[PDB]
Design a binder for this molecule. Structure first.
Ligand code: LMT
Ligand code: LMT
Ligand code: LMT
Ligand code: LMT
Ligand code: LMT
Ligand code: LMT
Lengths: 262, 262, 262, 262, 262, 262, 262
């Protein structure tokens, strides 16, 4: 029969809903304004969206604390419950947040760009795109790999395609009776007739190891990154043909045998 | 004999039960409304159920704090005890929550879809379905594997079936005395007569290594993902037959032996 | 001589004991009621016992805070001491709680059931039972293994017995001079006369590799999970007998030897 | 000269010491009563001692907070300092507490008992006793191993001695020219004359693999855990003697050699 | 000109210094008294020093909070700053505290004592002393190893010197044509003439494996820990001499060779 | 109609905006002043920027707490929400902060400088630059590697280029019948005629191992870091030529063969 | 126009700056006094600098809380912001603090000193100096290694140079037909004529293993740490010369061959 307290309670509830509505409006407005202010200062779009989302959820948290205080919930209760909900959402989004930060770093510092062959922790292939949470790459034989950004940032990032020039390394092994000067002279002529091998870099042709069955010569020559494999195959076929023409042997595995007829 | 205090205590208990009932009702209603509001905005059904469950448990926590305050328990006591119960439930559900978030990410970004052959951390097989906590896959020989979603998201996701085309790589090894031009010409004719090998891609036929007993030619040819294995087996049998017809040898392992009758 | 303060102190102590007794009674009653309410809603019995134990310990914590406030201990002291005791009990029960949650998940989602051969992280054997903290399994030779549930849930769960059908894979290796058509025809007749090999699945008989001493044919045939091993042994003995009858050889390891009498 | 404040200070100090003494007495009494109440309910003695120690230290903490409040230290100061001392003691006792809980679990669920051969994470030997913090075991050759209980509970617990029966697995390898029916018949007679091999279990004698130099027969037979090794050695010597009597050969490693006098 | 407030400030500062001095005195006295009280109850000296240091730093913390309150710093400020300093000191001393607790456990339970050969996680050598933070051991060839106590407690502790008796295991391999009864009889006589081999234990002499080139007999005999190596060397030389006298052969690695003059 | 409360609310909002503006101004000024004060004291530029950023964000946090208190938000709400936003930003920047600190340490202590060959955790190459978050290095063959600074600081940092002098180690293996004095004399003359080998260091020429087919001499000689590889190749070719001239043999792998015509 | 409030605000600001200045002065003075008091008590210089830095930053924190309270910032705000700045600085300095504590432990307990050969976790070389954050060592061939102190303290610390004496272990392998008494007598005379081998230690010369092609004698002899390698090389050359003079053979790898002309 006494509606006056009921009127006060309904009025407090309507005031709580009005505070919620106005708080969502002001949160969206201040967050969009901070986002435009950051984009105008050339902050990265993902960092801008992240900081704007944090500002919007903070203003919404103040609005919730105010409205729930209007309905009689204490500030300590609302802070504890919003903290538990935030800890749950943070447990769900912890790894995704790590991948988001790693993706921002990969887009900012550019350890690798799309189209560059790389080697991210033992997998290797052409990069296709860095994305919000993971990087796609196509391996040499066409398989697609999707590496999460945090694993990429946490480890080494070998990059085959960054330097214009790269070095071949042949390991020719010839018979122990082969002349050393003739081998070095033939390998030197083979790498001096190769126009794609850079003459201003190193061009080693040195005996390198006395192996179990052969003396292993090493040849190290530099070439542009686009000519590396073709130079390898061409120098290899030329080595084979010229050694076969010159009489130098490539040994089969060797074994002395001390015969004992028991 | 003095029932007035007893009446006040029974009235406070009934008011606490009434606050509990009304609080559960309002919690269920606001949670269903937030869930419908999120589903209408095309949020994922699992993220919608998660955020709605958080809203419902938060409103129930406010209701518990209010009723337990009506029975005389202090707000600090109720917050501490609900925080301990929430920390226990969170210790129980930590890994399941990680798998739930990883499953939401796998369904959203689609690193792999059902029916695509993959390789999730060293296990490989056709995917069957991504589920709330774990992914099922059937390996090539019919074993079922159940990989938890967090392990899948944390590591690499090789995907054999995403790209339409993929590359074969034969490694033929022939005797050192074999002619190189004849080997390359026979392998080239074999891969040029193969209609399932894409002629617009690479078709390498290059000497690749001077091995212990053989010179290892490499052949790399591209084909549609569905023709890859049949092209491998057909080119392999054709290589065998044509080399046997042409007189080119596949060496047995070689060994020079220096006889010494001691 | 002034017993009035002594009377007030003894009365406060008796009131604290009465609050403790009534609080234990109400805790047991509300916990049993919540447990019956959950079991009636078809919640899992272990989750029901867990949530009921949490409700009972929470009501006991409120009762302790009330009684210890009656004896003059402050609410902050009781909350801090109960929090330290709860942190100690939680450090003791952390791993057991992880195993309990993993066991609930294994009983709910059924990645494997009792009597199904599995492979949980490198150990393999018939499952015997999933239990509250660990799973028992009997390996193929009769050893018992007890894997804690958390280790099982955290890793892959290969399941040999789930699919009705599974694939055999023979790897026959014959001499390089062997006819390929005759080998493929004999293997095809051997797998076509085998009634336990499913004719509606794949039945590959393809040359697969040119090995060091032999050409390795592959045979892949599907059969029901109960016939897999018997089909393997029967096809193997039939391959051996028919190749010996047809004159096809299984090579011994090969080695060319270039004799050099030095 | 004004001793009245000095009298009040000395009286407060004596009251603090009296509160400390009475609090230690009541703590010891309530802890012993809770310990007897738990032991009477058949709780494990270690869990009883743990919960009683927690009750005793909690009552001592309330007594310290009361006395230090009597000397003028605030409740927040005493709670913070006791919390720091408890965090230090907990950092010191964290691993010992994990081992204590794991030892309680090992004594309760009995994955292994004393005198049973086991394999706890790659070490194997007869168990000697489970103790409060670590398990002792004597390996087959007499070395003692002391494995902490937490490492045991965290990993697999293979148990060689639990099942009454266990399976032998011989892998006989005979020459390719050996008759298969004669080999299977001799192995079958050898395992049928062995009274310690259980005839109601499996008794496989199947050709299993066509190896590099031999066809590997497999023999799997079950026997009681106490007869396993003696049955292995006896069947092995009988296999050797009967194959030597029957003319079946055990091949030496084989190698074809294609002689080439260059 | 108004020195009265200056007098009050100087008096408060002198009172703060007096509280600091008296608090350090009372802290040292109560800590020494608790230390003597623990040593009198046969607590370990390191645990006694640890708990006494905690009591002394706690009383000093109360004294600091009181004096800094006298100079006007609030209790919350002093608690926060002392908590930050304690968290920094704890980050510095975390590992040293873990090693201290592990050293107390190693001195209490004695998994190993000084002079006993052990194997702590893959390093092995005579123990020299357990110390406050690390254990010293001298390996068999005289290198000193210093293993931190926490690494020792966390892993297995194999102990070669605890059991009085230990088992040798010879693995003799003889030619396939060797008589089995003669080999077993010679090995049995060799281990029956050895007085240092315990006749009340096992003395197996069983054929154990049919190897690639030899049948591997096993001999397992027990002896006192001090006679183990001398018994090994003596039985080994006796096996060699008696087999050479009896005509039994130790095979060289075997290889059939199928000659093919191509 | 009653605008007086509306005037008070608009005035409080304008005062909050004015406090925000003045607080940002004072934050930027005090942060720039602290930054100049640190740079003037020769603090590292990165540590200066870090501490100045912390001072600026702290002053901005005080300004936010003041303005949000002016609009009616409580201090506890603002502290909790700013703490949640700071915990989120810290979860995003945790790894980047670890790399920043590691980069400051690498620039301060200089374990390696640019242009020095190193080996950071199994990858090796010339360092190019240490940067804010990762170190770039060019391997010997031209690949670029980008190692995050925290991984570098956490592990070993081998440094090939720091010491002026470094040691070669040849391992010559000659036939068992070779004279030892003649081998040692020839190797000694070869390393005494080499002017780039430091005569004031060690120059060992000792028989080191009796191998399976050869006695392995060791030669260890020191040389300047720039002459190391050229000295290796020159001494190797001189060893080969002088041994071939002196008649000393480099054995092929050896094998006695006990012929048995069965 | 009303400057009185403006005068009060400017006066409060000047009082805050005066409190800041006086607080920095008193912080520096008390920190230097505590540092001198610790150095006078022979505390380590690094622990003294650490505790003095903690005292100085604590007094500065009290001064900041007082001044910021004078400008109107609440104590809770200042404590929260200083706690966030301290948590950020602690996240940056966590690893450096671990290395600092480990370096203090290495300088105090001296597991190794400069100039002693060691083996810290698989890297080995002469120690050069222990430093504030990392230890430098020069490997045997002149590479410099920089191991962070925490990695050193966390693992084993083998120390080759601590014990005055160390043991050589030769493993001579002679032909099966060689006399055992003659081999043992020659090895005994060789190690008895070696004056640098300690005659008061063990001098084993025992047959140790019957290998695939040779009986492996073991020789274990002790010598001073400075004579170890020279004794090894001298005993090795003497073994070689005396066995060649006595007619004892070092076998080449052996192989029986059962000829079969098929
Ligand atoms: C009340 C605040 C509500 C809003 C903020 C919510 C925060 C939620 C925090 C959840 C717990 C985060 O705890 C985090 O766990 C990882 C586990 O590898 C650890 O640190 C980790 O950081 C990233 C993830 O951010 C990982 O990819 C990385 O491998 C590791 O360094 C630390 O322990 C801590 O950074
Ligand atoms: C009072 C609030 C009540 C409601 C919220 C309850 C929260 C309960 C939190 C329990 C502890 C979580 O602590 C978590 O532990 C894991 C351990 O790998 C670490 O972080 C982990 O996150 C996920 C799980 O979320 C793991 O799959 C992942 O391997 C790892 O990065 C961090 O330390 C922290 O994220
Ligand atoms: C005041 C509240 C009293 C009642 C609640 C008591 C809670 C006690 C918590 C103790 C500390 C738990 O801290 C826990 O440690 C493990 C260590 O692997 C980490 O997380 C772990 O969770 C489970 C155990 O729950 C492990 O099996 C899992 O390997 C790991 O992910 C996180 O760091 C945190 O989940
Ligand atoms: C104020 C309260 C005073 C009384 C209570 C004192 C509690 C002291 C807690 C110290 C820190 C414990 O932090 C613990 O660290 C280990 C580190 O592996 C992790 O969890 C660990 O639990 C056990 C030990 O209990 C380990 O054997 C296990 O390998 C791991 O899962 C979690 O991080 C947390 O459980
Ligand atoms: C309210 C304050 C707001 C401002 C400050 C925000 C701080 C945010 C802290 C996030 C959690 C940090 O938790 C951190 O996790 C890593 C996980 O490897 C662990 O420690 C780590 O430190 C660094 C990163 O700093 C890692 O590179 C390192 O591998 C590891 O030692 C510790 O658990 C803790 O240092
Ligand atoms: C408000 C206080 C402000 C001043 C004090 C600031 C403290 C800052 C603490 C940052 C987090 C430290 O968290 C730390 O993380 C490491 C991560 O390996 C873990 O412990 C670690 O300690 C040291 C570093 O101290 C590591 O080298 C070690 O490998 C590991 O045991 C623990 O989780 C915790 O010791």
């Amino acid at each position: 029969a006494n509606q006056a307290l009921l009127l006060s309670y309904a009025v407090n509830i309507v005031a709580a809903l009005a505070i919620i509505i106005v708080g969502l409006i002001i949160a969206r407005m201040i967050s969009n304004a901070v986002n435009r202010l950051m984009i105008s200062r050339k902050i990265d779009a993902t960092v801008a969206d992240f900081l704007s989302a944090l500002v919007r959820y903070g203003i919404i948290a103040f609005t919730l604390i105010a409205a729930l205080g209007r309905v009689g919930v204490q500030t300590a209760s609302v802070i504890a419950v919003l903290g538990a909900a935030g800890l749950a959402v943070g447990l769900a989004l912890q790894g995704s947040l790590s991948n988001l930060a790693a993706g921002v770093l990969l887009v900012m510092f550019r350890p690798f760009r799309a189209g560059e062959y790389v080697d991210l922790g033992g997998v290797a292939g052409t990069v296709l795109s860095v994305q919000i949470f993971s990087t796609t790459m196509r391996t040499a034989d066409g398989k697609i790999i999707v590496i999460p950004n945090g694993k990429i940032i946490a480890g080494n990032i070998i990059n085959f395609s960054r330097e214009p020039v790269r070095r071949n390394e042949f390991i020719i092994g010839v018979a122990y009776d082969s002349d050393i000067d003739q081998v070095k002279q033939i390998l030197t002529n083979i790498i001096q007739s190769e126009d794609r091998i850079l003459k201003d870099r190193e061009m080693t042709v040195r005996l390198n190891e006395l192996g179990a069955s052969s003396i292993n010569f090493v040849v190290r020559v530099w070439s542009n990154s686009g000519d590396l494999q073709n130079v390898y195959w061409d120098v290899l076929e030329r080595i084979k043909r010229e050694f076969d023409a010159a009489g130098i042997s490539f040994p089969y595995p060797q074994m002395d045998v001390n015969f004992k007829r028991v």
